[PDB]
Amino acid sequence: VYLDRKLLTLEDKELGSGNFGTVKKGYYQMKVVKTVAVKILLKDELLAEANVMQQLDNPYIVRMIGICEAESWMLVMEMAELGPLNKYLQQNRHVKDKNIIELVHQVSMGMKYLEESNFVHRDLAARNVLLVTQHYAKISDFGLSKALRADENYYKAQTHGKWPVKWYAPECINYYKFSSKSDVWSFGVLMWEAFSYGQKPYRGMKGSEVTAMLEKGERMGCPAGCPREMYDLMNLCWTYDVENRPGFAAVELRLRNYYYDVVNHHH
Numbered sequence: 393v394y395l396d397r398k399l400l401t402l403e404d405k406e407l408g409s410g411n412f413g414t415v416k417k418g419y420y421q422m423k424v425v426k427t428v429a430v431k432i433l434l435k436d437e438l439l440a441e442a443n444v445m446q447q448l449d450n451p452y453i454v455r456m457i458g459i460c461e462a463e464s465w466m467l468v469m470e471m472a473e474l475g476p477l478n479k480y481l482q483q484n485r486h487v488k489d490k491n492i493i494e495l496v497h498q499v500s501m502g503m504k505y506l507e508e509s510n511f512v513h514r515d516l517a518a519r520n521v522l523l524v525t526q527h528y529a530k531i532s533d534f535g536l537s538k539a540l541r542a543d544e545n546y547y548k549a550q551t552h553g554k555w556p557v558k559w560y561a562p563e564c565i566n567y568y569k570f571s572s573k574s575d576v577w578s579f580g581v582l583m584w585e586a587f588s589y590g591q592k593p594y595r596g597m598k599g600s601e602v603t604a605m606l607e608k609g610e611r612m613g614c615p616a617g618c619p620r621e622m623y624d625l626m627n628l629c630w631t632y633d634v635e636n637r638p639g640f641a642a643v644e645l646r647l648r649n650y651y652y653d654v655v656n657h658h659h
């Protein structure tokens with residue numbers, strides 16, 4: 393869990409930055425050296441994220457090397473060189489439809505594992521997916537993540553905070569209730585963003601106007617070039633009723649079959 397600071401080499405230029413803090417590129421001496429992504433600061437929220445990540449073991453989840461306490465608290469991760477999914481698709485609009493299906497199905501696989509593990513992500517969005525290659529996606533940013541209690545299928549938040557409302561299910565807004573089903577809702581928004589090549593959902597709308605629109609039964613339209621079947625799944629993830637909304641096991645199966653169907657059609 394705890395890493396030796398002298399084994400860590402940090403690069404001067406910041407790889408990434410945001411309201412969360414900063415991301416720096418580094419090297420961790422393990423016989424070989426390991427290229428790492430280091431998240432810098434709050435201490436309770438960083439240790440809590442590390443505690444969640446330590447318990448996770450999946451190919452479609454960013455791996456935590458460990459934590460380091462120096463000048464600031466550091467979350468040391470395995471490097472995904474291509475960065476955030478939304479920023480990548482924005483910079484590469486020539487990425488084929490099949491490649492978008494491949495990447496969102498990988499996210500559904502990591503989320504399926506996360507659901508089986510009774511963990512709620514609570515910040516599933518394209519900005520929080522990282523690319524190892526153009527054909528390899530991993531879920532990151534576990535700072536709002538909660539291990540569900542043995543007796544409950546949801547996490548109840550005690551009062552409001554800094555929340556990405558455009559990704560949140562109506563029950564998250566109306567009852568402060570976060571489940572794997574509510575992560576399914578965020579995933580539908582994530583699908584929309586990927587098929588819109590990193591475009592922001594609910595363009596020019598306030599958080600409250602988005603709540604008003606969803607309550608009326610209105611949903612985001614089909615992105616240009618997005619297949620019928622993927623927009624149907626998007627709308628299914630956007631089922632207002634938590635009970636009738638599918639879980640990741642069913643969302644991953646629809647994506648898995650659709651991907652192989654596109655793969656077959658290709659050759």
Ligand SMILES: CNC(=O)c1nc(C)n2ccc(Nc3nccc(-n4cc(CN(C)C)cn4)n3)cc12
Pocket residue numbers: 407408409410412415429431454469470471472473474475476519520521522532533
């Ligand atoms: C905000 N900008 C970036 O993160 C970023 N920008 C560029 C150009 N990158 C290149 C590689 C990379 N790798 C990489 N690997 C493993 C983990 C991470 N984490 C990044 C976050 C932060 N979260 C909001 C996304 C959490 N983990 N990041 C990241 C970035």
